CSV table of C-alpha atoms and ligand atoms in Angstrom, one decimal:
chain,number,residue,atom,x,y,z
A,1,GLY,CA,-51.1,1.1,-43.5
A,2,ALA,CA,-50.5,3.4,-46.5
A,3,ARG,CA,-46.9,4.3,-47.4
A,4,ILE,CA,-45.3,6.6,-44.9
A,5,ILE,CA,-44.4,9.7,-46.9
A,6,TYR,CA,-42.8,12.8,-45.3
A,7,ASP,CA,-42.1,16.0,-47.2
A,8,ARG,CA,-39.0,18.1,-46.9
A,9,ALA,CA,-40.5,20.6,-44.5
A,10,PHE,CA,-41.8,17.9,-42.2
A,11,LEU,CA,-38.5,16.2,-42.0
A,12,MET,CA,-36.6,19.5,-41.4
A,13,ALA,CA,-39.1,20.4,-38.6
A,14,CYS,CA,-38.2,17.0,-36.9
A,15,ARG,CA,-34.6,18.0,-36.5
A,16,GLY,CA,-35.1,20.7,-33.9
A,17,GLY,CA,-38.8,19.8,-33.1
A,18,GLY,CA,-38.7,16.0,-33.3
A,19,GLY,CA,-39.8,13.4,-30.9
A,20,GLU,CA,-43.3,14.8,-30.5
A,21,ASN,CA,-45.1,12.1,-32.6
A,22,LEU,CA,-48.4,10.9,-31.2
A,23,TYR,CA,-47.0,7.3,-30.8
A,24,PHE,CA,-43.7,5.4,-30.7
A,25,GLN,CA,-42.8,7.4,-27.6
A,26,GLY,CA,-42.6,10.4,-29.9
A,27,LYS,CA,-40.5,9.0,-32.8
A,28,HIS,CA,-41.8,9.2,-36.4
A,29,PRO,CA,-41.2,5.8,-38.1
A,30,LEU,CA,-40.0,5.6,-41.6
A,31,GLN,CA,-41.4,3.4,-44.4
A,32,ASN,CA,-38.1,1.6,-44.6
A,33,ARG,CA,-35.2,0.7,-42.4
A,34,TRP,CA,-31.9,2.1,-43.8
A,35,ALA,CA,-28.2,1.2,-43.4
A,36,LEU,CA,-25.4,3.7,-43.7
A,37,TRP,CA,-22.1,2.3,-45.1
A,38,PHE,CA,-18.6,3.8,-45.5
A,39,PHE,CA,-16.0,2.7,-48.0
A,40,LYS,CA,-12.4,3.9,-48.6
A,41,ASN,CA,-10.2,1.9,-51.0
A,42,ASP,CA,-7.1,1.4,-48.9
A,43,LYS,CA,-4.8,-1.2,-50.5
A,44,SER,CA,-3.1,-2.0,-47.1
A,45,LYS,CA,-6.4,-3.7,-45.8
A,46,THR,CA,-8.7,-6.2,-47.5
A,47,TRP,CA,-11.8,-5.0,-49.4
A,48,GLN,CA,-13.9,-6.6,-46.6
A,49,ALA,CA,-12.3,-4.4,-43.9
A,50,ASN,CA,-12.5,-1.3,-46.2
A,51,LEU,CA,-16.4,-1.6,-46.3
A,52,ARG,CA,-17.9,-0.6,-42.9
A,53,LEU,CA,-21.6,-0.7,-41.8
A,54,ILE,CA,-21.8,2.5,-39.7
A,55,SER,CA,-25.3,2.4,-38.5
A,56,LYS,CA,-28.9,1.5,-39.2
A,57,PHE,CA,-32.0,3.5,-38.4
A,58,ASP,CA,-35.7,3.5,-39.0
A,59,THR,CA,-37.1,6.7,-37.6
A,60,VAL,CA,-36.8,10.4,-38.6
A,61,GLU,CA,-35.4,11.3,-35.1
A,62,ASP,CA,-32.7,8.5,-35.4
A,63,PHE,CA,-31.9,9.7,-38.9
A,64,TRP,CA,-31.2,13.2,-37.5
A,65,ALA,CA,-29.3,11.8,-34.5
A,66,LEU,CA,-27.0,10.0,-37.0
A,67,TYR,CA,-26.8,13.1,-39.3
A,68,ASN,CA,-25.8,15.3,-36.4
A,69,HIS,CA,-23.1,12.8,-35.2
A,70,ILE,CA,-21.7,12.3,-38.7
A,71,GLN,CA,-21.6,16.1,-39.2
A,72,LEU,CA,-19.4,16.1,-36.0
A,73,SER,CA,-17.4,12.8,-36.5
A,74,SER,CA,-16.6,11.5,-40.0
A,75,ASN,CA,-14.0,11.7,-42.8
A,76,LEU,CA,-14.7,14.0,-45.7
A,77,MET,CA,-11.6,13.3,-47.8
A,78,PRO,CA,-11.0,12.2,-51.4
A,79,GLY,CA,-11.5,8.5,-51.9
A,80,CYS,CA,-14.4,8.3,-49.3
A,81,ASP,CA,-17.7,6.8,-50.5
A,82,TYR,CA,-20.8,6.9,-48.2
A,83,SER,CA,-23.9,4.9,-49.1
A,84,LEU,CA,-27.4,4.8,-47.7
A,85,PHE,CA,-29.3,1.6,-48.7
A,86,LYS,CA,-32.4,-0.1,-47.7
A,87,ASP,CA,-31.7,-2.8,-45.0
A,88,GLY,CA,-30.8,-6.0,-46.7
A,89,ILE,CA,-29.4,-4.5,-49.9
A,90,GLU,CA,-25.7,-4.4,-49.9
A,91,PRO,CA,-24.2,-1.3,-51.5
A,92,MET,CA,-22.7,-3.2,-54.5
A,93,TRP,CA,-23.8,-4.1,-58.0
A,94,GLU,CA,-23.7,-7.8,-57.2
A,95,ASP,CA,-26.6,-7.6,-54.7
A,96,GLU,CA,-29.6,-9.3,-56.2
A,97,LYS,CA,-31.5,-6.0,-55.9
A,98,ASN,CA,-28.8,-4.0,-57.8
A,99,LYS,CA,-27.6,-6.5,-60.5
A,100,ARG,CA,-30.3,-5.4,-63.1
A,101,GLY,CA,-30.2,-1.7,-61.9
A,102,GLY,CA,-28.8,1.6,-62.6
A,103,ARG,CA,-28.3,5.1,-61.2
A,104,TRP,CA,-29.4,8.7,-61.6
A,105,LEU,CA,-26.1,10.6,-61.4
A,106,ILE,CA,-25.3,14.1,-60.3
A,107,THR,CA,-21.6,15.2,-61.0
A,108,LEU,CA,-20.3,18.2,-59.2
A,109,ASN,CA,-17.4,20.6,-60.0
A,110,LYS,CA,-14.9,21.4,-57.2
A,111,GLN,CA,-16.5,24.9,-56.7
A,112,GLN,CA,-19.7,22.9,-56.0
A,113,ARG,CA,-18.1,21.0,-53.0
A,114,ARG,CA,-18.4,24.1,-50.7
A,115,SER,CA,-21.7,25.5,-52.3
A,116,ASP,CA,-23.7,22.4,-53.1
A,117,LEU,CA,-22.3,19.0,-51.9
A,118,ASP,CA,-23.8,19.1,-48.4
A,119,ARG,CA,-27.2,20.5,-49.6
A,120,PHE,CA,-27.5,18.1,-52.6
A,121,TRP,CA,-26.6,15.1,-50.4
A,122,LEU,CA,-29.1,16.1,-47.7
A,123,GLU,CA,-31.8,16.5,-50.3
A,124,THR,CA,-31.0,13.0,-51.7
A,125,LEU,CA,-31.2,11.5,-48.2
A,126,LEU,CA,-34.6,13.2,-47.6
A,127,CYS,CA,-35.9,11.8,-50.9
A,128,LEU,CA,-34.9,8.4,-49.7
A,129,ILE,CA,-36.1,8.4,-46.2
A,130,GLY,CA,-39.3,10.4,-47.0
A,131,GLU,CA,-40.3,8.0,-49.9
A,132,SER,CA,-40.6,11.0,-52.2
A,133,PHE,CA,-41.2,9.0,-55.4
A,134,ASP,CA,-44.7,7.7,-54.3
A,135,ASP,CA,-45.1,4.0,-55.4
A,136,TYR,CA,-41.9,4.2,-57.4
A,137,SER,CA,-40.0,4.7,-54.2
A,138,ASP,CA,-40.1,0.9,-54.0
A,139,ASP,CA,-37.6,0.8,-57.0
A,140,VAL,CA,-35.1,2.9,-55.0
A,141,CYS,CA,-32.2,0.8,-53.6
A,142,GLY,CA,-30.1,3.5,-52.1
A,143,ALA,CA,-27.8,6.5,-52.7
A,144,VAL,CA,-24.1,6.9,-53.0
A,145,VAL,CA,-21.8,9.9,-52.5
A,146,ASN,CA,-18.2,9.6,-53.9
A,147,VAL,CA,-15.8,12.3,-52.7
A,148,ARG,CA,-13.2,12.9,-55.4
A,149,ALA,CA,-10.5,15.5,-56.2
A,150,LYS,CA,-11.7,15.4,-59.9
A,151,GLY,CA,-15.3,16.2,-58.9
A,152,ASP,CA,-17.7,14.7,-56.4
A,153,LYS,CA,-20.6,12.5,-57.5
A,154,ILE,CA,-24.1,11.7,-56.0
A,155,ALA,CA,-26.3,9.0,-57.3
A,156,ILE,CA,-29.6,7.4,-56.6
A,157,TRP,CA,-29.5,3.6,-57.4
A,158,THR,CA,-32.6,1.9,-58.5
A,159,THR,CA,-33.4,-1.9,-58.9
A,160,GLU,CA,-34.4,-2.3,-62.6
A,161,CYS,CA,-32.9,-0.3,-65.4
A,162,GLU,CA,-35.9,-1.5,-67.7
A,163,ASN,CA,-38.6,-0.1,-65.5
A,164,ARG,CA,-39.0,3.0,-67.7
A,165,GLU,CA,-42.0,4.7,-65.8
A,166,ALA,CA,-40.4,4.2,-62.4
A,167,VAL,CA,-36.9,5.3,-63.4
A,168,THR,CA,-38.1,8.4,-65.2
A,169,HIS,CA,-40.5,9.4,-62.4
A,170,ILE,CA,-37.6,9.1,-59.9
A,171,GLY,CA,-35.3,11.2,-62.1
A,172,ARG,CA,-37.9,14.0,-62.6
A,173,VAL,CA,-38.8,14.3,-58.9
A,174,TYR,CA,-35.1,14.0,-57.9
A,175,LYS,CA,-34.1,16.9,-60.2
A,176,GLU,CA,-37.2,18.9,-58.9
A,177,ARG,CA,-36.2,18.3,-55.3
A,178,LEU,CA,-32.5,19.2,-56.0
A,179,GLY,CA,-33.8,22.5,-57.5
A,180,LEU,CA,-31.7,22.2,-60.6
A,181,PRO,CA,-32.4,24.6,-63.4
A,182,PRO,CA,-34.2,22.8,-66.3
A,183,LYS,CA,-31.2,23.2,-68.5
A,184,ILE,CA,-29.0,21.1,-66.2
A,185,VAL,CA,-29.6,17.7,-67.6
A,186,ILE,CA,-29.1,14.6,-65.4
A,187,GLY,CA,-28.7,11.1,-66.8
A,188,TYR,CA,-29.5,7.5,-65.9
A,189,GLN,CA,-27.1,4.7,-66.7
A,190,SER,CA,-27.4,1.0,-66.0
A,191,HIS,CA,-24.7,-0.5,-63.8
A,192,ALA,CA,-23.7,-2.8,-66.7
A,193,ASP,CA,-23.0,0.3,-68.9
A,194,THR,CA,-21.0,2.1,-66.0
A,195,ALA,CA,-18.7,-1.0,-65.9
A,196,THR,CA,-17.2,-0.2,-69.4
A,197,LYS,CA,-18.5,3.2,-70.7
A,198,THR,CA,-25.8,13.5,-71.9
A,199,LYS,CA,-26.0,10.4,-74.2
A,200,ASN,CA,-27.4,8.3,-71.2
A,201,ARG,CA,-30.3,5.8,-71.4
A,202,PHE,CA,-32.7,8.3,-69.8
A,203,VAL,CA,-32.2,12.1,-69.4
A,204,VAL,CA,-34.4,14.6,-67.6
B,1,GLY,CA,-11.0,-18.2,-29.9
B,2,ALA,CA,-13.2,-15.4,-31.0
B,3,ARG,CA,-16.9,-15.6,-30.6
B,4,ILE,CA,-18.5,-18.1,-33.0
B,5,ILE,CA,-21.0,-16.1,-35.0
B,6,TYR,CA,-23.1,-17.6,-37.8
B,7,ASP,CA,-25.4,-15.5,-40.0
B,8,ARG,CA,-28.8,-16.5,-41.2
B,9,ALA,CA,-27.7,-17.7,-44.6
B,10,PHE,CA,-24.9,-19.9,-43.2
B,11,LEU,CA,-27.2,-21.5,-40.6
B,12,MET,CA,-29.9,-22.1,-43.3
B,13,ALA,CA,-27.3,-23.7,-45.7
B,14,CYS,CA,-26.3,-26.2,-42.9
B,15,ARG,CA,-29.8,-27.7,-42.8
B,16,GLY,CA,-29.6,-29.3,-46.2
B,17,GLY,CA,-25.8,-28.9,-46.6
B,18,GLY,CA,-24.6,-29.5,-43.1
B,19,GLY,CA,-21.9,-31.8,-41.7
B,20,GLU,CA,-19.1,-30.6,-44.1
B,21,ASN,CA,-17.2,-28.5,-41.6
B,22,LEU,CA,-13.4,-28.8,-41.7
B,23,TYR,CA,-13.3,-30.2,-38.2
B,24,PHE,CA,-15.5,-31.9,-35.5
B,25,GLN,CA,-16.1,-34.7,-38.1
B,26,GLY,CA,-18.1,-32.1,-40.1
B,27,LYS,CA,-20.2,-30.5,-37.3
B,28,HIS,CA,-20.1,-26.7,-36.8
B,29,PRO,CA,-19.9,-26.0,-33.0
B,30,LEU,CA,-21.9,-23.2,-31.5
B,31,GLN,CA,-20.6,-20.6,-29.1
B,32,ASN,CA,-23.0,-21.9,-26.4
B,33,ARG,CA,-24.7,-25.1,-25.5
B,34,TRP,CA,-28.5,-24.8,-25.4
B,35,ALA,CA,-31.3,-26.6,-23.7
B,36,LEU,CA,-34.8,-26.9,-25.1
B,37,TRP,CA,-37.6,-27.0,-22.4
B,38,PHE,CA,-41.3,-27.7,-22.7
B,39,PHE,CA,-44.0,-26.6,-20.3
B,40,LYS,CA,-47.7,-27.1,-20.1
B,41,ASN,CA,-49.7,-26.0,-17.1
B,42,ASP,CA,-51.7,-29.2,-16.3
B,43,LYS,CA,-53.3,-29.1,-12.8
B,44,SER,CA,-53.5,-32.9,-12.6
B,45,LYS,CA,-49.6,-33.2,-12.4
B,46,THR,CA,-47.1,-31.2,-10.2
B,47,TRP,CA,-45.3,-28.1,-11.6
B,48,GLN,CA,-42.1,-30.2,-11.8
B,49,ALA,CA,-43.6,-33.0,-13.8
B,50,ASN,CA,-45.1,-30.2,-16.1
B,51,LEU,CA,-41.5,-28.7,-16.9
B,52,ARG,CA,-39.6,-31.1,-19.2
B,53,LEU,CA,-36.0,-30.9,-20.5
B,54,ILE,CA,-36.4,-32.1,-24.1
B,55,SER,CA,-32.9,-32.0,-25.4
B,56,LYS,CA,-29.6,-30.2,-25.3
B,57,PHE,CA,-27.4,-29.3,-28.3
B,58,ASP,CA,-24.2,-27.5,-29.1
B,59,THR,CA,-23.7,-27.7,-32.9
B,60,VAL,CA,-25.6,-26.3,-35.9
B,61,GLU,CA,-26.2,-29.8,-37.3
B,62,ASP,CA,-27.7,-31.0,-34.0
B,63,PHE,CA,-29.9,-27.9,-33.8
B,64,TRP,CA,-31.3,-28.8,-37.2
B,65,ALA,CA,-31.7,-32.5,-36.2
B,66,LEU,CA,-33.8,-31.4,-33.2
B,67,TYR,CA,-35.7,-28.8,-35.3
B,68,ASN,CA,-36.6,-31.4,-37.9
B,69,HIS,CA,-37.7,-33.9,-35.2
B,70,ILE,CA,-39.8,-31.4,-33.3
B,71,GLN,CA,-41.3,-30.3,-36.6
B,72,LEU,CA,-42.5,-34.0,-37.0
B,73,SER,CA,-43.1,-34.9,-33.3
B,74,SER,CA,-44.3,-32.2,-30.8
B,75,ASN,CA,-47.5,-30.5,-29.6
B,76,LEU,CA,-48.6,-27.2,-30.9
B,77,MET,CA,-51.7,-26.5,-28.8
B,78,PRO,CA,-52.9,-23.6,-26.5
B,79,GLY,CA,-51.1,-23.6,-23.2
B,80,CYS,CA,-47.8,-25.0,-24.5
B,81,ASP,CA,-44.7,-23.0,-23.8
B,82,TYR,CA,-41.3,-23.9,-25.4
B,83,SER,CA,-38.1,-22.3,-24.2
B,84,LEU,CA,-34.5,-22.4,-25.5
B,85,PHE,CA,-32.0,-21.3,-22.8
B,86,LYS,CA,-28.3,-21.4,-22.5
B,87,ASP,CA,-27.2,-24.5,-20.6
B,88,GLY,CA,-27.3,-23.9,-16.8
B,89,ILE,CA,-30.0,-21.3,-17.0
B,90,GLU,CA,-33.4,-22.6,-16.0
B,91,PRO,CA,-36.2,-21.1,-17.9
B,92,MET,CA,-37.7,-19.3,-14.9
B,93,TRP,CA,-37.4,-15.8,-13.3
B,94,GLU,CA,-35.9,-17.2,-10.1
B,95,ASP,CA,-32.8,-18.4,-11.9
B,96,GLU,CA,-29.8,-16.2,-10.8
B,97,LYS,CA,-29.3,-15.2,-14.4
B,98,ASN,CA,-32.9,-14.1,-14.9
B,99,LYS,CA,-33.9,-12.5,-11.6
B,100,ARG,CA,-32.6,-9.0,-12.6
B,101,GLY,CA,-33.7,-9.5,-16.2
B,102,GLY,CA,-36.4,-8.8,-18.7
B,103,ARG,CA,-37.6,-9.6,-22.1
B,104,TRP,CA,-38.1,-8.2,-25.6
B,105,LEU,CA,-41.7,-9.3,-26.5
B,106,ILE,CA,-43.4,-10.0,-29.8
B,107,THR,CA,-47.2,-10.4,-29.6
B,108,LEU,CA,-49.0,-12.0,-32.5
B,109,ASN,CA,-52.7,-11.9,-33.3
B,110,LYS,CA,-54.4,-15.2,-34.5
B,111,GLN,CA,-54.0,-14.4,-38.2
B,112,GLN,CA,-50.2,-14.5,-37.5
B,113,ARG,CA,-50.4,-18.2,-36.1
B,114,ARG,CA,-50.4,-19.4,-39.7
B,115,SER,CA,-48.5,-16.5,-41.5
B,116,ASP,CA,-45.8,-15.6,-39.0
B,117,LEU,CA,-45.4,-17.9,-35.9
B,118,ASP,CA,-43.1,-20.5,-37.3
B,119,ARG,CA,-40.9,-17.9,-39.2
B,120,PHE,CA,-40.7,-15.5,-36.3
B,121,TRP,CA,-39.8,-18.4,-33.9
B,122,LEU,CA,-37.2,-19.8,-36.3
B,123,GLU,CA,-35.6,-16.3,-36.7
B,124,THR,CA,-35.5,-16.0,-32.9
B,125,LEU,CA,-33.7,-19.3,-32.6
B,126,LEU,CA,-31.2,-18.4,-35.3
B,127,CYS,CA,-30.4,-15.1,-33.4
B,128,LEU,CA,-29.7,-17.1,-30.3
B,129,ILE,CA,-27.6,-20.0,-31.7
B,130,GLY,CA,-25.8,-17.7,-34.1
B,131,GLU,CA,-24.8,-15.1,-31.5
B,132,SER,CA,-26.3,-12.3,-33.6
B,133,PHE,CA,-26.0,-9.5,-31.0
B,134,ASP,CA,-22.1,-9.5,-31.1
B,135,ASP,CA,-20.7,-9.0,-27.6
B,136,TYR,CA,-24.2,-8.3,-26.3
B,137,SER,CA,-25.2,-11.9,-27.1
B,138,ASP,CA,-23.6,-12.7,-23.7
B,139,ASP,CA,-26.6,-10.9,-22.1
B,140,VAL,CA,-29.1,-13.2,-23.8
B,141,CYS,CA,-30.5,-15.9,-21.5
B,142,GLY,CA,-32.9,-17.6,-23.8
B,143,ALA,CA,-36.2,-17.3,-25.7
B,144,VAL,CA,-39.7,-18.4,-25.0
B,145,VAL,CA,-42.7,-19.0,-27.2
B,146,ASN,CA,-46.2,-19.1,-25.6
B,147,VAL,CA,-49.0,-20.7,-27.7
B,148,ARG,CA,-52.3,-19.1,-26.6
B,149,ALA,CA,-55.8,-18.8,-28.0
B,150,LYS,CA,-55.8,-15.0,-27.2
B,151,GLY,CA,-52.6,-14.5,-29.3
B,152,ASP,CA,-49.2,-16.2,-29.3
B,153,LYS,CA,-46.1,-14.5,-27.8
B,154,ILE,CA,-42.3,-14.8,-28.5
B,155,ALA,CA,-39.7,-13.3,-26.3
B,156,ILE,CA,-36.0,-13.0,-25.9
B,157,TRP,CA,-35.0,-12.9,-22.2
B,158,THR,CA,-31.9,-11.0,-21.2
B,159,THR,CA,-30.0,-11.1,-17.9
B,160,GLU,CA,-30.0,-7.5,-16.7
B,161,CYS,CA,-32.8,-5.0,-17.3
B,162,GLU,CA,-30.4,-2.0,-16.5
B,163,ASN,CA,-27.8,-2.9,-19.1
B,164,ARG,CA,-29.2,-0.2,-21.4
B,165,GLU,CA,-26.7,-0.5,-24.3
B,166,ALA,CA,-26.9,-4.3,-24.4
B,167,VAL,CA,-30.7,-4.4,-24.1
B,168,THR,CA,-31.2,-1.8,-26.8
B,169,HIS,CA,-28.7,-3.4,-29.2
B,170,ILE,CA,-30.5,-6.7,-28.8
B,171,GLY,CA,-33.9,-5.2,-29.5
B,172,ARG,CA,-32.8,-3.3,-32.6
B,173,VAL,CA,-31.1,-6.3,-34.2
B,174,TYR,CA,-33.9,-8.6,-33.2
B,175,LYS,CA,-36.5,-6.3,-34.8
B,176,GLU,CA,-34.2,-6.0,-38.0
B,177,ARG,CA,-33.8,-9.8,-38.1
B,178,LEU,CA,-37.6,-10.4,-37.7
B,179,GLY,CA,-38.0,-8.0,-40.7
B,180,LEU,CA,-40.7,-5.9,-38.9
B,181,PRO,CA,-41.7,-2.7,-40.5
B,182,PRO,CA,-40.3,0.4,-38.6
B,183,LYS,CA,-43.8,1.4,-37.4
B,184,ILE,CA,-44.3,-1.9,-35.6
B,185,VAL,CA,-42.9,-1.1,-32.2
B,186,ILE,CA,-41.6,-3.8,-29.9
B,187,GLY,CA,-41.0,-3.3,-26.1
B,188,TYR,CA,-38.8,-4.5,-23.3
B,189,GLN,CA,-40.1,-5.1,-19.9
B,190,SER,CA,-38.4,-6.3,-16.7
B,191,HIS,CA,-39.6,-9.5,-15.3
B,192,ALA,CA,-40.4,-7.6,-12.1
B,193,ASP,CA,-42.8,-5.4,-14.1
B,194,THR,CA,-44.4,-8.4,-15.9
B,195,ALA,CA,-45.3,-9.8,-12.5
B,196,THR,CA,-47.8,-7.0,-11.8
B,197,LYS,CA,-48.3,-4.8,-14.9
B,198,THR,CA,-46.1,0.8,-26.1
B,199,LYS,CA,-45.3,2.4,-22.7
B,200,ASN,CA,-42.5,-0.2,-21.9
B,201,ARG,CA,-39.0,0.6,-20.5
B,202,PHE,CA,-37.3,0.5,-23.9
B,203,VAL,CA,-39.1,0.5,-27.3
B,204,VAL,CA,-37.6,0.1,-30.8
C,301,W4K,C1,-19.1,12.2,-43.5
C,301,W4K,C2,-19.7,13.4,-44.1
C,301,W4K,C3,-20.5,13.1,-45.4
C,301,W4K,O1,-20.7,14.3,-46.1
C,301,W4K,C4,-21.2,14.2,-47.4
C,301,W4K,C5,-20.2,13.7,-48.3
C,301,W4K,C6,-21.8,15.6,-47.7
C,301,W4K,O2,-22.7,16.1,-46.7
C,301,W4K,C7,-21.8,12.5,-44.9
C,301,W4K,C8,-22.1,11.1,-45.1
C,301,W4K,C9,-23.2,10.5,-44.7
C,301,W4K,C10,-24.2,11.2,-44.0
C,301,W4K,C11,-25.5,10.6,-43.6
C,301,W4K,C12,-26.0,10.9,-42.3
C,301,W4K,C13,-27.1,10.3,-41.8
C,301,W4K,C14,-27.8,9.4,-42.6
C,301,W4K,C15,-27.4,9.1,-43.8
C,301,W4K,C16,-26.2,9.7,-44.3
C,301,W4K,F1,-25.8,9.4,-45.5
C,301,W4K,C17,-24.0,12.6,-43.8
C,301,W4K,C18,-22.8,13.2,-44.2
C,301,W4K,N1,-22.6,14.6,-44.0
C,301,W4K,C19,-23.5,15.4,-43.2
C,301,W4K,C20,-22.9,16.8,-43.2
C,301,W4K,O3,-23.0,17.5,-44.5
C,302,W4K,C1,-44.9,-27.1,-32.0
C,302,W4K,C2,-43.5,-27.0,-32.1
C,302,W4K,C3,-43.0,-25.6,-31.8
C,302,W4K,O1,-43.5,-24.7,-32.7
C,302,W4K,C4,-43.3,-23.2,-32.4
C,302,W4K,C5,-44.3,-22.8,-31.4
C,302,W4K,C6,-43.5,-22.5,-33.7
C,302,W4K,O2,-42.6,-22.9,-34.7
C,302,W4K,C7,-41.4,-25.6,-31.8
C,302,W4K,C8,-40.8,-25.6,-30.5
C,302,W4K,C9,-39.4,-25.6,-30.4
C,302,W4K,C10,-38.6,-25.7,-31.6
C,302,W4K,C11,-37.2,-25.8,-31.5
C,302,W4K,C12,-36.5,-26.8,-32.3
C,302,W4K,C13,-35.1,-26.9,-32.1
C,302,W4K,C14,-34.4,-26.1,-31.3
C,302,W4K,C15,-35.0,-25.2,-30.5
C,302,W4K,C16,-36.4,-25.0,-30.6
C,302,W4K,F1,-37.0,-24.1,-29.9
C,302,W4K,C17,-39.3,-25.7,-32.8
C,302,W4K,C18,-40.7,-25.7,-32.9
C,302,W4K,N1,-41.3,-25.7,-34.2
C,302,W4K,C19,-40.5,-25.9,-35.4
C,302,W4K,C20,-41.4,-25.8,-36.6
C,302,W4K,O3,-42.4,-26.9,-36.6
């Protein structure tokens, strides 16, 4: 049918009042299937054994079941990365869907770990699963949270750094959904530029 | 050793670049040996003369040799059934390994005979031979394709309809590997229920 779009209030209502959809034995299907990955760079193990597929889901209710479980069981320590990517896109630059891409980046201060990290990450996840960028949601690959002593980072990765209209729409809506004051500028950088380098390619 | 698991890309690469394994004079052995059966209900012959063992194989390269041959020489007409089952499991409910079982069913409409039947059947076969359900692949008995004017059907048969964790894992991974949109619900039904009866026992 048409793209399955859910707004923030609808998704939030499914957490405590989910499972009452009119089909799918009550589950609300998502537009896309998503995979959650965990990474921690531990030099004692291989890179392969450091990247872990945690879980895949494709309904609102299964997203919340995973969210609730992670909220109870998972490591929030420096050096952890968590990534939510569309099924079939590995959470790495070399994936065919990421090689030409880039990311909208949010950088937090340490004071913002207690005030803002959880709420900004949740808002990011809802933008993803809810297809909040209308047709330009198709350019979204995934999102990454890096937990770091120097300051945590959240990013939305998109497929094509030269798709100006898609990339800028995603950034504007993401900023709006995060609720950031206008004066707090966020930037988009291609993955190629992040490999070796406010002055970003696009700013909103 | 450990379970022999092959992903889709590896299996696909063996079709045109097969026979270069480091042992077995180049063949890649499968975890299981498999038997391909054909059935057509023809009232002029007995039931036993209507069920035919076509061939058995136990390597990736011999799977592709059979695939290529069937693709050239075999009947695709309404009333045909083809079944790929682990060696020693007959493709019938009464087999000891199927009596307590059930199936994940995919039902096609006629527009999907040309767009989807071959690709969905191939993806099913790759899930089977590649042991794509990890430890729960041991609950897989086989798969069946029914060619019908009213709409073709593909199913994965499993051994125990009350093994909830195994059955549900198989269904989720099968749906993921078929690439079905989240909103396209597939259902599991016990063979006992198929004998006399969206509302299925498990849905994913
Ligand atoms: C492990 C805690 C981690 O914390 C972040 C850094 C801030 O929140 C984290 C990771 C992934 C998910 C997640 C869950 C379901 C689907 C997709 C996901 F990415 C949720 C959480 N944390 C929830 C509690 O805040
Ligand atoms: C008409 C041939 C039939 O078509 C199906 C319905 C759709 O594709 C069919 C049956 C069995 C196999 C098969 C081959 C090797 C191992 C196991 C198998 F089940 C392959 C094909 N078709 C290949 C594409 O022509």
